[PDB]
Symmetry: C5
Subunit: 78 residues, 5 copies
């Protein structure tokens, strides 16, 4: 839980599979999770858990603000 | 089968000289393209927009980031996923 | 005459030669010829015509090279 | 010496608390071999919000300065300054 | 045969820029004959340089590629003669 990023401002069509492939460019990714509504539907953010800590500052610089389906993601850390 | 739609982009603000062949080669850089269509007038003219159908849906968010706003004969295209 | 594989390149610095433009635009595909017309007194003018072998080079070249600075002066590409 | 070490050392300020000497070594290594990196701690402590990066080759100094100045580490851009 | 068409003026130099640094930097535009940072009448380096390329094409290439680049925080100002 020290190598995890918060990716907000996600467009409705962004899936976990898309973010994994995107953040994998910053290093091996253990898993991605878009939390689902209390009644099943995705929320508009994901948690991206890297294997290595260095992927965190690398991923932020590399991908912060990148547009997915027109909407720029917002990366935060802790 | 009709999604097909999940893999289609609306490309607007097309210069009249842009051909279906050009868009194909252009959007092929984002992945395999199944078909491209520039709808036709009742006088055969272009309506200044097209539909690009990719094979994989990952190409969709990729083509957008990579081509949206690119100028074709001076006119910047406008890519929309559903339009 | 169906040679619309040709671009106009205005706003040329005095030191831009046909050789330079050929080499510069060759990055967008084979070039048949480049021309800088000379004026009434044998002096080159401030624009050029670049004729491509393939039409696809035109939209490519426009997007790739337009507004690039040669000797500090940005070229102004036009189709017709 | 220790002035030939002063002309091969850069001051890197506006650091995020999370930035470690290791991260900086790897980052500035992209501008050439790095002898040593030091984030000073004071009195307690503590530690400080800047770093000293000592290159082996003086050429790395203007290179790194022009290559890495202003890039964001954990959202905070680093401030490189030569002597 | 005094070719100034293959030489660039590089002004607004930081005092720590050397002829060796400008050589290696401008070499990225093609072979470089010589680089000169002139001296004043008292033998003190000036804050501009002359870069002589072997090929004229390096001129428009170099100044499009390197003009305004910061050396020790100071952007160089390239001018073609």
């Amino acid at each position: 839980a020290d190598r995890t990023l918060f990716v907000g401002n996600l467009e409705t069509k962004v899936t976990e599979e898309l973010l994994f492939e995107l953040f994998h460019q910053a290093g091996p990714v253990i898993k991605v999770k878009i939390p689902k509504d209390k009644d099943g539907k995705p929320k508009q953010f994901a948690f991206v858990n890297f294997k290595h800590e260095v992927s965190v500052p690398y991923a932020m610089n590399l991908l912060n603000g990148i547009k997915l389906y027109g909407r720029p993601i917002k990366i935060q850390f802790r």
